[PDB]
Amino acid sequence: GKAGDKEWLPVTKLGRLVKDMKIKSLEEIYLFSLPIKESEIIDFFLGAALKDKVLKIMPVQKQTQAGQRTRFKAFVAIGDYNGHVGLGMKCSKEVATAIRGAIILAKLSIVPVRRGYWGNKIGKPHTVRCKVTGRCGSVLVRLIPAPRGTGIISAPVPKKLLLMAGIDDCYTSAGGCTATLGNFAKATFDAISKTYSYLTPDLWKETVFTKSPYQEFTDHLVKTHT
Amino acid sequence: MQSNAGEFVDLYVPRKCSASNRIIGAKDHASIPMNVAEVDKVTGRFNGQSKTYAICGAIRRMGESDDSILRLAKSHGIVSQN
Amino acid sequence: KDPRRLFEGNALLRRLVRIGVLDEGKMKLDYILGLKIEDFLERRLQTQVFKLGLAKSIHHARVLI
Amino acid sequence: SGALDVLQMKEEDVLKFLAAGTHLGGTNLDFQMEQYIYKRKSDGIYIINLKRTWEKLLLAARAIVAIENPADVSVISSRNTGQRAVLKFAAATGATPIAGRFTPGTFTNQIQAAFREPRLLVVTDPRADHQPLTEASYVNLPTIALCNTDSPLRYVDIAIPCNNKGAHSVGLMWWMLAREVLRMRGTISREHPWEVMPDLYFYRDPEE
Amino acid sequence: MGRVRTKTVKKAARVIIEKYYTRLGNDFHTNKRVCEEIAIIPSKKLRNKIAGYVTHLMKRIQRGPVRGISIKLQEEERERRDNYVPEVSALDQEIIEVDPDTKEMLKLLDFGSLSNLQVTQPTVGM
Amino acid sequence: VRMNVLADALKSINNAEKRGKRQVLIRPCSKVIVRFLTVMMKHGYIGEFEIIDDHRAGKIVVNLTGRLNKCGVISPRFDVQLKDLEKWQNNLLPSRQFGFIVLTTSAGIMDHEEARRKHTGGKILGFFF
RNA sequence: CGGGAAACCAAAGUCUUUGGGUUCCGGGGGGAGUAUGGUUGCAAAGCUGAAACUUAAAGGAAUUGACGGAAGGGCACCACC
């Protein structure tokens, strides 16, 4: 392809390390729990070859002095196929912007997924380590590990998110007003994200850990400006 | 996170709180650790060589990170009769 | 080792292998779990009569048969 | 002790401290601060543990060394009593500054003109400087702080108990920190005394 | 009132004054000439309105520092003023007068000191 | 009043770990509480515990690490039939792989893995992971 | 902390990670606390309590205007003075 790459320039030290080829995977950020504020960071480290699917469009409105207003809300999900996903909702004047912003929002939110084995761990993880549930304003989604070939047993919208996350097989049960899509996807998003939070016995032991690329790269991440 | 042939799979092993032994997970940016300098004994002379602790969002929001550091710093020095 | 699991597992496997549907490492249960439809679909006539020239079409094959 | 000797108490300092009336401590304890407390004076007031106030201050100092780029430790005060104080600390040690109206969106929010990514915040009143203490907890930055007996412990790891009701107590403690950090990983050498008069830290104010 | 200077004007005044203080003056007539030299302003009425408000400022500045304006000279003046320090005030005069307990504060602090006792009576809340 | 004593001990624990606590004082304790605390201990989910002897019913101090997501109690103590154990662990355990259902059988208070190996069964006490 | 749709709630917390004891009532809205039998009552009435039919929303909460012979509000001879 040839369209003339932009000229991203970074606000953030985390960003400088990334462009410099100093940070190479999101994992570094995730382990450090560095916050990510520049969307390009996500874009350079992953996202390249990460596909975004727009989930919904539904319009809303609120009342003006001289009567009405109405605008477009877009729900976007992003993820490779393996282990990374994000979710973003935006409402804007125009569909394109609503989608364009939503994608940006989704990327900022990208989250780790811990994918595991239903039980006999051969040939790499097909499902989830444990069972994790997430709730958003009365909708709650529960993910359950399942045997191979089970696949994603969820509603179409949820299947799509789980798919991008890179889950092969998982059982789901959903309670609450499933109809209100923004809520259902949000809860499932919380559910998947919760997998990293689960502490299993595998995790029980600790570690010099890390010094943080921010510290080692520190000079590197104070360029020659101010 | 082993696989079939003792191989290490998925993608990362998170750091664990220095106070509660609970996963820092991964987007909770209301949490940070704290590198304490080692001293070339005797006194002064910051010499590296960090003595380091990581504290969870939880402990910190509950109005600990500090003490936790002290149980942490004294138990392994410096800090005495705290 | 559970007489029920042993006696019927081995049988399911042996049955699945006679038809070529399944292969040995598979040829344990842990592998059938990680299997799919093509694997059966591949064993019908129709596609074989193609698969060795004696049809040159999954088409030709079915009308031949 | 710990790191091994000289580093202990020094009457000279316990003299400056008592003089500056640090240990005097707030009538309202607060629960998370109970450890600092030495004893309660009659006629209500609490005596802070200077020994404890001391050691933590040193522990603070050490955490300020170990940051490599000294500029990116932010010393902070909206309180008047601590304004010249922090300005001085920033002059000596690397340490960039944030006085007065902290300005919200300084840690979160790239776009802004006071955008800073410190690796360490030191705050003087956790109640007055609550904004910086909150923003810092939106972005994984450790916090040293000025705490009297009744200060918010939320999102502050490391306290140095003071008096912060005021006077020279806020002056001395910022002074001693800069004095301490220059000693460590600096170049004072000889955790021997000051060519700088501690008054240089201390609040200014008005005019007739 | 009816003439309330708008930001486009008021801004320019803060602006020039910040980079022009020692050049500018007390008098409308001259700054007006100065705005021609130090700024490019499109209509004459605007430039006049600017010169005029900035003069109203200079008139005020030259009678007391004004809420949001800083110039190199004013910084220097505050700097020099912000030196003062006498015979000095504490002393406090021979002997501190203590409230005791504060006497017991030193007594049980291993600390000599000057003295005086007058600390009794309780002690109502509100 | 009190029907069971286990349920209190377990809950007390769970809230300790949820707070970020590293110790608890449970009251009042029992042979069954000890036995359950013990199965937990063998597996790592708690540190060491200590039965203090008031001249009454006991008080226990448990020192806990933080490997514990949850330790629950099942009431009532349903009877389980060897192929209702398979059904229980699935109902209430995170992955097939880990976490234990702990029950009481004629041959001792045990985690269900030990149950499967002995080849005995009984009535369900509780769980953890 | 945590709960809840929120308003809120240290209990309305410890609820999908759903299991401390026990008791009661509800399953769209109207028909209806109505009909009918029983019961209690001097009486007035009370308790128990349907259906046929009717209908796609009834309802809750928060958000925002519009609007008020609600409160502080203003502004204009298209308003008064």
CATH number at residue E34: 1.10.60.20
Return the structure tokens found at A99: 């989608």
Amino acid, res. D23: H
Chain A positions touching C30 (Cβ under 8 A) are 120, 122
Give ∠ CA A185-A187-A188 in degrees, rounded to 5.
65
Contact yes or no for F13/F71 (Cβ under 8 A): yes
Q: Residue E40 is part of which domain span? A: 7-62
Nearest to E34 by CA among E46, E16, E18, E49: E16
| Cα D137 from Cα B31, distance rounded (Å) | 7
Q: Mutate which of F17, F40, F45, F95 to disrupt the A interface (most A C-beta within 10 Å)?
A: F95
Taking phi over 0 as left and psi of -120 to 50 as alpha, with beta for the rest, B79 belongs to left
Contact A124, A162 (CB under 8 A): no
Q: By C-alpha distance, which of E53, E43, E48 is closest to E15? A: E53
Q: Are residues F58 and F9 in the same domain?
A: yes
CATH code of the domain covering residue F74? 3.30.1490.10
Q: Which residues on D lie below 8 Å from B25 (Cβ)? A: none
**Touching subunits for chain E (3+ Cβ pairs under 8 A):** D
Tell me: do F79 and F94 sit in the same domain.
yes
Give the single-character DSSP code of A49: B
Q: Which of D101, D78, D81, D87 is nearest to D204 (CA)?
A: D81
In which residue are the tokens 């006085």 written? D99
Contact F5, F33 (CB under 8 A): yes
The neighbouring-strand residues paired with F23 are: F63
D156: region left, alpha or beta (phi > 0 left; psi from -120 to 50 alpha): beta
**Listed residue (A213, A215, D190, D207) closest to B35, CA to CA:** A215
d(CA F43, CA F100): 9
CB of residue F12 closer than 7 A to nucleic acid strand G?
no
Q: Which residues of C touch A126 (CB under 8 A)?
A: 34
Strands (E), chain A: 51-56, 59-60, 71-79, 84-92, 111-112, 132-136, 139-145, 152-153, 170-175
Is strand G within 7 Å of residue F3 (CB)?
yes
* Amino acid (1-letter code) at residue D109: N
Long-range contacts of E23-26 (CB under 8 A, 24+ apart): E24/E54, E24/E55, E24/E58, E25/E55, E25/E58, E26/E55, E26/E58, E26/E59, E26/E62
Q: How many CA atoms lie within 13 A of A105 on its CB side?
A: 18
Q: From D67, which residue of chain A is nearest by alpha-carbon distance?
A: A215
Q: Where are the domains of chain D?
A: 13-208
A-D C-beta contacts closer than 8 Å: 23
- Total Cβ atoms within 10 A of residue F46: 23
Residues F46, F64 within the same domain: yes
Do the Cβ atoms of D146 and D127 come closer than 8 Å?
no
Is-contact E69 E57, C-beta < 8 A?
yes
Q: What DSSP character marks residue F52? A: E
Strands (E), chain D: 24-25, 37-41, 45-48, 74-77, 96-99, 121-123, 143-147, 159-161
Q: Do B60 and D185 touch (CB under 8 A)?
A: no
Place of tokens 């002056």: D171
Q: Please name which of F97, F96, F95, F89 lies closest in space to residue F126, comparing C-alpha atoms.
A: F89
CA D69 – CA D73 distance, rounded (Å)? 8
A186: alpha, beta or left, given left = phi > 0 and alpha = psi -120 to 50? alpha
Strand order in the sheet with D96-99: D96-99, D74-77, D121-123, D143-147, D159-161
Domains present along chain B, CATH in parentheses: 1-82 (3.30.1230.20)
Distances from the Cα of D73 to the Cαs of C65, E31, F79, F96, in angstroms? 83, 45, 63, 49
Residue for token pair 């990374």: A84
Say whether D142 sits in a helix, a strand or coil.
coil
Host domain of residue F109: 69-129
The verdict on F63 touching B (C-beta cutoff 8 Å) is: no
Provide the CA A177 to C1' G54 distance, Å, integer: 29
* Elucidation method: X-ray
Separation in Å, CA E18 to CA A26, D100, E5, E32, E81: 47, 22, 19, 16, 21
DSSP-derived 3-state class of residue E49: helix
What is the end-to-end Cα distance of chain E in Å, rounded? 49
CB contact under 8 A, E111 and D18: yes
Q: Do the Cβ atoms of A158 and A188 come closer than 8 Å?
A: yes
Total number of domains constituting chain F: 2
Tokens of D30: 């607060």
Look up the CATH number of the domain holding residue F7: 3.30.1370.30
Q: Which nucleotides of strand G lie under 7 Å from a protein CB?
A: 1, 4-6, 13-14, 16-21, 63-66
Spatial distance between the Cα atoms of D70 and F18, rounded to a whole number of angstroms: 38
Are residues F16 and F75 both part of a single domain?
no
Four-point Cα dihedral D181, D186, D187, D192, nearest 10: 20
Alpha helices in chain E (DSSP H): 7-20, 28-38, 44-61, 72-81, 102-107
Q: Are residues F6 and F62 in the same domain?
A: yes
What is the C-alpha separation between A187 and D188, in angstroms, rounded?
57
Give me the half-sphere count of Cα atoms (radius 13 Å) on the Cβ side of residue D195: 6
For residue D65, which of F48, E96, B44 has the smallest C-alpha distance? B44
Helix (H, G, I), strand (E, B), or coil: what is residue E51? helix
Which residues are within 8 A (CB) of A68 and not within 5 positions of it... i.e. 6 or more apart?
A61
For F58-122, the DSSP string reads -EEEEE--S--S---B-SS--B--SSSHHHHHHHH-SBTTB-EEEEEETTEEEEHHHHHHHT--E
* Separation of alpha carbons A28 and B69, rounded Å: 24
- Look up residue D79 and give its two tokens: 């309180």
Rounded Cα gap, residues E23 and F82, in angstroms = 98
